[PDB]
């Protein structure tokens, strides 16, 4: 089991203050990189790769 938000498409929200963030890609089964515009979007949105890996891979 992993949190439900791991299965969401990565969402840059509606702002343009783009910063790198990490999300889980279920199609490829790994954590990957996107640009987040800084406001809104969803919880498939991590500051580090390591964090994405520990939350959206496997059942903790």
């Amino acid at each position: 089991e992993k949190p439900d938000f791991c299965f969401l498409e990565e969402d840059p929200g509606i702002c343009r203050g783009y910063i790198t963030r990490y999300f889980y890609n279920n199609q490829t089964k790994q954590c990957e990189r996107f640009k987040y515009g800084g406001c809104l979007g969803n919880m498939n949105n991590f500051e580090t790769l390591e964090e994405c890996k520990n939350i959206c891979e496997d059942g903790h």
Partner: antibody
Framework: EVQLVESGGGLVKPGGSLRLSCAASGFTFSNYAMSWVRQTPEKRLEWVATISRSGSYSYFPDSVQGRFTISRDNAKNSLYLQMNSLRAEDTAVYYC??????????????WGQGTTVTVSS | DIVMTQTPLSLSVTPGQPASISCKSSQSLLESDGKTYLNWYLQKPGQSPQLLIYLVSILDSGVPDRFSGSGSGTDFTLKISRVEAEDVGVYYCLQATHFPQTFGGGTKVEIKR
């Protein structure tokens, strides 16, 4: 054996509009974000739009942002770049590319041969 | 935006001799996952740019092993160990660590005959 085939370029008057199409073949289209890059006559290259896999989210740089919009159709393997408010400086060849994924360092690849947009009176 | 400065503008190389092309970024390209998003393209005569190298040093499928990439932070280097006829064209760099992703101005390569 990926192929991307842009069409839709022509002359457009300044402040006018034009839609460009990209027809994709040879891979599972909805698995990839997709991009447009342009090349000016001075042969400068400039990334100008990205659409997310589902087609729900898009990115654009400040130079085109609020003038251009993008959409895709995953049942048809196509995407469309709607350009509005065209200015002299949007004259370029526009190329479609595939955003190759995290394992490919987010590089764009498989650029089409491109369609040429000319903004003139 | 990040400015990518490529030198030389052009180069002319004896066949079988090496060639080198520099790309310098105005800020470090080191990303928060520890990788570096610096890529090399080739535009061959009559063709659109094609990916040669991504993540600084990784060859794309089908790129000859004559080509290699190195560097880090702000300073990058494309090398052709022994130049051949097929390598002629304009080479560009691209960085994608920072938004918006931005190209180098290109470097034309001519081969001697």
């Amino acid at each position: 054996e990926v192929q991307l085939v842009e069409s839709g370029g022509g002359l457009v008057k300044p402040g006018g509009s034009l839609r460009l199409s990209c027809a994709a073949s040879g891979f599972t289209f909805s698995n990839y974000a997709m991009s447009w890059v342009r090349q000016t006559p001075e042969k400068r290259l400039e990334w100008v739009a990205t659409i997310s896999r589902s087609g729900s989210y898009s990115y654009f740089p400040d130079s085109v942002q609020g003038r251009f919009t993008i959409s895709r159709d995953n049942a048809k393997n196509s995407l469309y770049l709607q350009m509005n408010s065209l200015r002299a400086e949007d004259t370029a060849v526009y190329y479609c590319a595939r955003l190759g994924g995290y394992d490919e360092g987010d590089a764009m690849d498989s650029w089409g041969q491109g369609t040429t947009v000319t903004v003139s009176s | 935006d990040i400015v990518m400065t490529q030198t030389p503008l052009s180069l002319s190389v004896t066949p079988g001799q090496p060639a080198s092309i520099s790309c310098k970024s105005s800020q470090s390209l080191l990303e928060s996952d520890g990788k570096t998003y610096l890529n090399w393209y080739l535009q061959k005569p009559g063709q659109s740019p094609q990916l040669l190298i991504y993540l600084v040093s990784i060859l794309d499928s089908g790129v000859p092993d004559r080509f290699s990439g190195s560097g880090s932070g702000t300073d990058f280097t494309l090398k052709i160990s022994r130049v051949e006829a097929e390598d002629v064209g304009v080479y560009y760099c691209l960085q994608a660590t920072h938004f918006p992703q931005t190209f180098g101005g290109g470097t034309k390569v001519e081969i001697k005959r």
